[PDB]
Design a binder for these strands. Structure first.
Lengths: 235, 279
DNA sequence: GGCTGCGTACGTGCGGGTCGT
DNA sequence: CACGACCCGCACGTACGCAGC
């Protein structure tokens, strides 16, 4: 019984005080700036007096500044487009106006748009894009990597390696990196890979002279390794 | 003392009279169709008045239509001071329920910090509202829902789209199914890519990923596990003989309804680009 | 110190609401 | 479609503190 009573007092306190915080927020939100803090009644009178001073296009603006996209009413012949298409893909009413949209998609991405015209949503490519509708709208989203094995054997590379040192992936893909190491410090990289496996998910920079920041990657859920990421670059 | 008491009672009565007066009168002054205006709480009146005030201060039907999801407007404090009408189709809640008070009040805890750091110019992030829709229902019997948000600031403005839960699915796109650590289980593929479900099946999808993106993919995967669903960026995924292809994916988590237990994974994988660089 | 208007609080009984079973 | 179960907005009365013919 007492419980319900003091919980009543507490909760009503919170409600009152939140109505007073609403009252202050509203008090400063409205223009009548005054010397200092009128009573709540007068504050309200001024609120409604102000509020007597009285939409879709603002919403349009909002969407534009929220997506960086545009609108288009189509058939594949188009019949209308948003002007805001210009700060997006340029080409305003040039390859649009009344043109078929097909003459604006990537020449390869036409039959997918064909298979999607028997709600409606899809993703398309356009001349320099996610799009939804029923008419629709469209909006927009020296060093090289190397993936290895637990014992150093490669798995993946980045092509600009050929710019860095001058080699081609396939004559490295599958081979071993310790086979590429100058006999001097073949052990060093070995030690390095003796460490990254133990250094759970943390970097390790070694000097083969080519720097490289090798570190292990464990499967995010099961947190067990399957490869070592080693960005190597020259110096 | 009793005269001051009776006159205190009566004068205070006058006070409350003009109070309720100015409240329902402020309700009449709203943009709301009176069918709902004077019908609601005065504290609510405070909320939405404040909101619409800072709304019209901070500034055909074609547009909002084709959109998916709804409109969200915040300030530095987080008073979500605008919500588009279309909200009803999602969440289950209505605009008027939630137009101009806290955003953390309706987003799952253990998620607010994202909001925090994202009130610190282009922003793409996933949020955790509370759907009450399954038709509309009541709160606390309602549950957590996810929303991909793309937006910019000025006083923040956001587009919040919903995801396609494979409990309600639906030549460009192919589906896939995997374990938790992502070893395949069920697939469709060759046409656009190369390999076969027979050839792959049990293989870490991180292997057939590009290293340049696998960072973003692991970030959106930690998302996946920590959150509910996801819609990634644009994968540069490998082919059997070819180089990379621009790929998009809307994946989901399968919770075995038997005590909602993390069981399986399913990805709805879109494809964008053709196989670049054959040799 | 008297007594007043005057205003903002805290406490609470009561009508109308909604959830569980 | 009920009934007490409760939770809640909104009255309501009364309290404490400011000012001042």
């Amino acid at each position: 019984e007492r419980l319900a009573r003091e919980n009543h007092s507490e909760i009503e306190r919170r409600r009152r005080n939140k109505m007073t915080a609403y009252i202050t927020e509203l008090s400063d939100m409205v223009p009548t700036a005054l010397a200092r803090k009128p009573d709540k009644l007068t504050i309200l009178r001024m609120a409604v007096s102000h509020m007597k001073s009285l939409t879709d296009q603002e919403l349009k603006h909002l969407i534009l500044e929220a997506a960086d996209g545009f609108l288009f009413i189509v058939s594949g012949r188009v019949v209308y487009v948003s002007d805001s298409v210009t700060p997006v893909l340029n080409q305003p009413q040039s390859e649009w106006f009344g043109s078929t949209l097909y003459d604006q998609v990537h020449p390869d991405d036409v039959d997918k748009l064909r298979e999607q015209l028997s709600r409606r949503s899809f993703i398309c490519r356009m001349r320099c894009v996610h799009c939804t509708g029923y008419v629709a709208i469209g909006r927009l989203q020296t060093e090289f990597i190397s993936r290895h094995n637990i014992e150093g054997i490669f798995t993946f590379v980045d092509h600009r390696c050929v710019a860095t040192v001058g080699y081609q992936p396939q004559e490295l893909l599958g081979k071993n990196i310790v086979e590429f190491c100058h006999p001097e410090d073949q052990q060093l990289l070995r030690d390095s890979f003796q460490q990254v496996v133990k250094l759970k998910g943390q970097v390790l920079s070694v000097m083969f002279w080519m720097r490289t920041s090798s570190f292990t990657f464990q499967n995010p859920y099961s947190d067990e390794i399957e490869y070592i990421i080693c960005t190597n670059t020259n110096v | 003392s009793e005269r001051r008491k009776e006159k205190s009672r009566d004068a205070a009565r006058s006070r409350r009279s003009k109070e309720s007066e100015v409240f329902y009168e402020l309700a009449h002054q709203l943009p709301l169709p009176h069918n709902v205006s004077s019908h609601l709480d005065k504290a609510s009146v405070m909320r939405l008045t404040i909101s619409y005030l800072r709304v019209r201060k901070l500034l055909d039907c074609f547009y909002l239509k084709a959109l998916d999801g709804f409109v969200m407007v915040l300030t530095d404090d987080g008073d979500m001071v605008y919500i588009s009408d279309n909200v009803n189709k999602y969440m289950g809640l209505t605009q008027f329920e939630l137009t101009g008070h806290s955003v953390f009040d309706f987003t799952h805890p253990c998620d607010h910090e994202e909001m925090r750091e994202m009130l610190t110019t282009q922003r793409s992030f996933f949020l955790r509202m509370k759907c009450t829709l399954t038709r509309t229902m009541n709160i606390k019997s309602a549950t957590w829902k996810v929303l991909h948000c793309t937006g910019h600031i000025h006083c923040l403005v956001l587009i919040c789209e919903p995801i396609p839960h494979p409990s309600n699915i639906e030549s460009k796109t192919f589906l896939s199914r995997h374990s938790l650590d992502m070893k395949f289980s069920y697939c469709d593929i060759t046409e656009l890519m190369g390999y076969e479900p027979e050839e792959l099946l049990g293989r870490s999808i991180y292997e057939y990923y590009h290293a340049l993106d696998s960072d973003h993919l692991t970030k959106t995967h930690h998302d996946m596990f920590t959150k509910g669903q996801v819609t990634t960026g644009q994968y540069r995924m490998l082919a059997k003989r070819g180089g990379y292809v621009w790929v998009e994916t809307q994946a989901t988590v399968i919770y075995n309804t038997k005590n909602s237990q993390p069981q399986c994974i399913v990805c709805v994988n879109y494809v964008v680009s053709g196989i670049i660089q054959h040799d």
